Amino acid sequence: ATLKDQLIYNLLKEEQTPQNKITVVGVGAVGMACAISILMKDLADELALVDVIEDKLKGEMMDLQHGSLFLRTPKIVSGKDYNVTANSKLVIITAGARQQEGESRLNLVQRNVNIFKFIIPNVVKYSPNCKLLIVSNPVDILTYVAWKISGFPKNRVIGSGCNLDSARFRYLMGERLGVHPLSCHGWVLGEHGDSSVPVWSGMNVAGVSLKTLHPDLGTDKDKEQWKEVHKQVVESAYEVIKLKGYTSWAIGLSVADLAESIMKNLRRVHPVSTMIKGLYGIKDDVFLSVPCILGQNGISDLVKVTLTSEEEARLKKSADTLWGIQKELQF
Amino acid sequence: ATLKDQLIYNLLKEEQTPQNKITVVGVGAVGMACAISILMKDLADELALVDVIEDKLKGEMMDLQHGSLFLRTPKIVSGKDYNVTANSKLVIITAGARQQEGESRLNLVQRNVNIFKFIIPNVVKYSPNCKLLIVSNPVDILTYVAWKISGFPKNRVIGSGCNLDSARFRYLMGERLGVHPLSCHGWVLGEHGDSSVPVWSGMNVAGVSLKTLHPDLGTDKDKEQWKEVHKQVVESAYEVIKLKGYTSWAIGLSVADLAESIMKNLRRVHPVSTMIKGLYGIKDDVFLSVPCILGQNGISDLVKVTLTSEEEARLKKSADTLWGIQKELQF
Amino acid sequence: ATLKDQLIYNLLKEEQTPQNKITVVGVGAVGMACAISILMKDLADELALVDVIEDKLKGEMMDLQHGSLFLRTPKIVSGKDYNVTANSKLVIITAGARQQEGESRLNLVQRNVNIFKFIIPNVVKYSPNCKLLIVSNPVDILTYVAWKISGFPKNRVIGSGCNLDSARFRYLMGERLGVHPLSCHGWVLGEHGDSSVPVWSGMNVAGVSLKTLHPDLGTDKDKEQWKEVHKQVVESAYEVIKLKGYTSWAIGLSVADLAESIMKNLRRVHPVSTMIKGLYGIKDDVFLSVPCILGQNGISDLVKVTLTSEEEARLKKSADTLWGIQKELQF
Amino acid sequence: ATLKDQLIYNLLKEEQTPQNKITVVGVGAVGMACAISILMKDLADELALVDVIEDKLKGEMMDLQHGSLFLRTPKIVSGKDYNVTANSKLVIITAGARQQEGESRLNLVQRNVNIFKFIIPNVVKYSPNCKLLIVSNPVDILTYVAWKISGFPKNRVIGSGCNLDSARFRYLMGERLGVHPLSCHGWVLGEHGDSSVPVWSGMNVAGVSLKTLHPDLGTDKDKEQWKEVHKQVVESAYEVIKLKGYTSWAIGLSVADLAESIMKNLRRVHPVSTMIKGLYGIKDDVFLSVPCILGQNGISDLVKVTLTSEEEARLKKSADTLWGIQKELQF
């Protein structure tokens, strides 16, 4: 008899079905940051990695596996075939084309659509009940694309949206005030990136309205120039990209935070990208970041934030731009 | 009055001395894996990053800072000047030279020595009471170098040594037996890399000696070829390097495990590289991996593993090789 | 419209089926220690508490609920009706009768049987696929009882058995050696309590056999009297009971450790009580503690520990005693 | 040579100085709930327990020690002599007299003063640099007493105050709205207990003011009777006490949350009891709960919450009552 059979008496042939499985698609810096963050928060009993570059994929998988002693996620697998993703509760999509210099936004989105036309039906085939969390940029449009291709109901297709931007906002707020960002409250909503909307009316510490204490907050008459905070939020990513080449750690952490609300059914509120038609005067199928209640069924509820006519106007303009692109897309 | 002063009443101007500070030197893939692993285990109240490449350094720092909302380490700093490292309890060195094409080993090692002649006195100046953890390769030699340059007592200079190799060994063992590596015990000792020694006599599950059940275990007559496991331990790292270009996650996790024993004064036993002269038959000032008890004073105690004459012979040969290299070095 | 409906837009009416639910039966000190340990390790998305004393039950539930802000288990429920336990993955039984003055052991055990005849079919009705973890004393016998009543296969009925005794053993060993118990290995097997068997041959640090270094280890000629360690393992529990009235924290922590292996499918090895007929020379349907691999299907595999004829004799004597009691029982 | 000395080579005689030590005074249900919560959050490298009932104290200590394998706090000690508390960073006081039926508030406070006159100088003697966290009831007065006796500056004497009441408020808010309490914001301030002040103006989700959406919020004209939420907060403890005899778990969790901000220097904002003279028109040395920034030096800063004249009036009346008692105290 083998050493194993001398040492160990087997009771069960186990038809291994994963109970809390997560898949990350794309093993670039973003995908791997998501993976390590997920592994270190014990959110999954099985982690699957998928990418088209087989050697890099295998290398990342093995590197993680070699750290198993220090983790509590007993199964880490990878493959270019989507059968490795079967029965995932949550599938995180980070794959996508990188925008070349002089490439139009439309062209970039169409390249990503061509990628998603392959990824999404494969994901859906093997995990028809999963939640989709889209991290790939441009996230609002790509969440829309994932939604269109998957045929999933809207509660189950979520874009990372302005979750990280809101985290950055709160970090900068905390630095200005000398308070941990957990205790600084403020929301960045709408379209991820330059057009996002900082909701000044909601910024507070301990329930104290900053806008109330300082009525010129976020305006051009503001002597403390709080507008810059938002400008910094918008530009931070660029700066990080200018400095180290890309951004990864912060995105990975924010994505793991989302994953945690979903996998643990927390019903926390996160600013994520969701199908917003019928709100704020928006009449098209577009996805924008609003505060959403996240749980085991994805987005169950939305918070209705009261906005100024100017803030609503920004949202509508974003919706118009997004739709102007989306209607050109070939599925 | 400013918004801050309308919102916040200050009681104290605080000369904040960090109480649980860790420094990582080198922000390549290894250093950043160490940093993220440390941040996600809440081991430090302040993390300092140091490197000579300033833009990359700043970018990595900012990327981590942007995730502050999701972390419990309130201060992350960086700089090329070592004054940012002041008052660290633990300093982790991952920096080192990369071997150029056609450069001899002695030359490469000498370049690392010259680098350490700058790094180490700077580290010691600002944190004279710290523990030094050397991760840079070749790790046994560079740990010797750090020890010589720092003038620290030997309990406070630790090389990562065979900690990860032992973790890999336990992973592979776990895969062969169908058991989590936490419950599979086995030690890889001696010189990190090709010359390491798998201590077959200690391999066990639930205290059951595998060698006793299978006396040919690890020999050439072993029909199950357990030798291959050790071979894979040695080679897997090369494989990962061939597949993805480098290794990072597993080393980061194992280093964070070491850091955890040190920062929490756990007195767990880890196979790390220590100045082993006067034990195990070793007669030169060399560092080799043995099981060490790690706590807040670094290595306070060593486990004396009973070895066969053949295992002892391998350790002595490693010591002779290491000393043969070290005596060529100029300090 | 209500405030909620002005604030929140609902997308979904959710039939929420909990995905990682745990039930604790009995809210005495042991049950509540288990509950708090489970809540602080984030093992469950729903925790159900059950007991016959309704006011105490409700109070404990509310007290836990009031700490929800500090926890990551979004649903805590309680009730005397077992419908609150529906769809549990793991059900932990701590309930049992207390021996009255002048009541025989057989009588006490029979009362526990009669209690289990109510509890177990109710548990099974609402969670037919759960794992049962029996903590109630006398644990080997009551685990047998739960197994008989439930009709579950043996992989799914687990007694806490000698898990805590082994933890205590490793603590005492750690105290003697100056090493954390995580790095001190030793197994207490067989019948929980006075008759348990310390397996001296497996006691080790870093794979170094203590028995090999010290052949008299655990015998009567042992000048260091390591036997006393086992004695203390047996007696410490009495001592704690004499000192504070009962024991709770350590058992709660050890049970949460078991739960963690089960809920996360870890396949770690734990010394738990399992139906051991056909192994270790045992010929009756009795439960004894051996090292078991624990995962999502309960006990999937057992480690076959090499024992001396004397150790085997002790196990057989325990089996005969247990069967001698069990055959008097009426189901 | 002993087995230990054969197995282990000692490098260091360690003058053991704790780096992150916490003391809990009082091992009643509250003290032990604090202790288990602290142990499970890895906030201390050493935990000291102190109480006057020696057998109960020893029993609790041993019970915790037996769970060491499952914890990462390597030293747990206890004693009636305060020398066991030496060099604590944080000392949590839960000891105190229990109010008898018909005992006046003044008489109860004086009994507690007599207890504190023994406890506090002993604590201060052995840990002159510690932060004091007073949990004993009535907490506002006893924090004042601890402050007077210790001679500590006010940043270093903190009362648990309305931290738990605010947590309960947020729990109830979450239940009314279907949102996790982490995402529900609301503050209970002032005097702990019936006279506490729910700050309706600050209640919000995602920065959306509930008071703005529902102007009658918290008034007698409120058709949804949100006032009841506060009444429930006030009464919850009584109910829990009526049901199970006392309250423990929630307090333990909230206290551990405070301890975490202090031990990790987080600078989070918590509603804790602090010396409030010179604010809200208060002219006496009284302690009330306001939002405080908590870190390694205790309370470094206060948030200035804008209150209505009615809310201020409630605070002033509380201050008057507290002072009316405090001026009768004999030190």
Author numbering:
A (entry chain A), B (entry chain H), C (entry chain H), D (entry chain A): 1 to 331
Authors' text:
LDH-A is overexpressed in many tumours and has therefore emerged as an attractive target for anticancer drug discovery. Mechanistically, LDH follows an ordered sequential mechanism whereby NADH binding to the cofactor-binding site precedes binding of pyruvate to the substrate-binding site; this is followed by a conformational change in which the active-site loop (residues 96–111 in hLDH) closes over the active site to provide a largely desolvated ternary complex.
These crystals belonged to a novel crystal form of hLDH-A in the tetragonal space group P4122, with unit-cell parameters a = b = 84.7, c = 276.0 Å. The active-site loops in the two molecules in the asymmetric unit are engaged in different packing interactions and accordingly show slightly different conformations. Glu103 forms a salt-bridge interaction with Arg111 and this may contribute to the stabilization of this conformation of the type II β-turn. The density for the side chain of Arg105 is not well defined and indicates flexibility in the apo structure. In the main conformation observed, Arg105 forms a salt bridge with Glu191. In the NADH-binding pocket, density for the side chain of Arg98 is poorly defined in the structure, indicating flexibility in the apo form of the enzyme.
